[PDB]
Amino acid sequence: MSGLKKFFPYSTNVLKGAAADIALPSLAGKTVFFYFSASWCPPCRAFTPQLIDFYKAHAEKKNFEVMLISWDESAEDFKDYYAKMPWLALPFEDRKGMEFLTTGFDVKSIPTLVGVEADSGNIITTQARTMVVKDPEAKDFPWPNVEAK
Amino acid sequence: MSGLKKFFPYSTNVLKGAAADIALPSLAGKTVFFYFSASWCPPCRAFTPQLIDFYKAHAEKKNFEVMLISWDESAEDFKDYYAKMPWLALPFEDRKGMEFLTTGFDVKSIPTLVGVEADSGNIITTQARTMVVKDPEAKDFPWPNV
The nearest alpha carbon in chain B to A100 belongs to: B42
Q: Could you give phi then psi for residue B89, rounded to 5 degrees?
A: -155, 140
> A139: which residues sit within 8 A by CB, 6+ positions away?
none
3-class state of residue A45 by DSSP = helix
In this structure, the number of other CB atoms found within 10 A of the CB of residue B4 comes to 18
Residue B29's region, left for phi above 0, alpha for psi from -120 to 50, else beta, is left
Nearest to A90 by CA among A3, A2, A10: A10
End-to-end CA distance of chain A: 31
For residues B106 and B24, the answer to whether their CB atoms sit within 8 Å is no
- CB-closest option in B41, B72, B99 to A123: B41
- CB-closest option in A121, A126, A144 to B43: A121
A 100-139 near B (Cβ less than 8 A): 104-106, 116-117, 120-124, 126-127
Q: Which CATH architecture has domain A1-149?
A: 3-Layer(aba) Sandwich (3.40)
Nearest to A134 by CA among A30, A71, A47, A42: A47
Q: Class for domain B1-146, per CATH?
A: alpha beta
Nearest to A118 by CA among B44, B51, B43, B22: B43
Q: How many residues does chain B have?
A: 146
3-class state of residue B73 by DSSP = coil
- CB-closest option in A7, A144, A147 to B108: A144
- Domain extents for chain B? 1-146
- Asked whether the beta carbons of residue A123 and residue B43 sit closer than 8 angstroms, the reply is yes
Q: Which residues of A touch B39 (CB under 8 A)?
A: 106
Amino acid, single-letter form, for residue B45: R
Nearest to B129 by CA among B106, B112, B117, B105: B112
Is B30 in CB contact (< 8 Å) with chain A?
no
Query: How determined?
Result: X-ray
β-pairing, B64-70 vs B88-89, is parallel
For residues B40 and A147, the answer to whether their CB atoms sit within 8 Å is yes
- Asked whether the beta carbons of residue B45 and residue A104 sit closer than 8 angstroms, the reply is yes
Q: Which residues of B touch A117 (CB under 8 A)?
A: 108-109
Q: Resolution to 1 decimal, in Å?
A: 2.3
Vertex B70 angle, CA A66 and B54, to 5°: 100
Q: Please give the interface size between A and B, counted as residue pairs whose CB atoms are below 8 Å apart.
A: 48
Sign of the four-CA dihedral B125, B86, A107, A145: negative
Which residue precedes each gap in chain B (C to N above 2.5 Å)?
Answer: none
Nearest to A2 by CA among B137, B47, B141: B47
Is A38 in CB contact (< 8 Å) with chain B?
no
- CB-closest option in B46, B72, B108 to A124: B108
- Give the whole-angstrom CA distance, residue B91 versus residue B75: 10
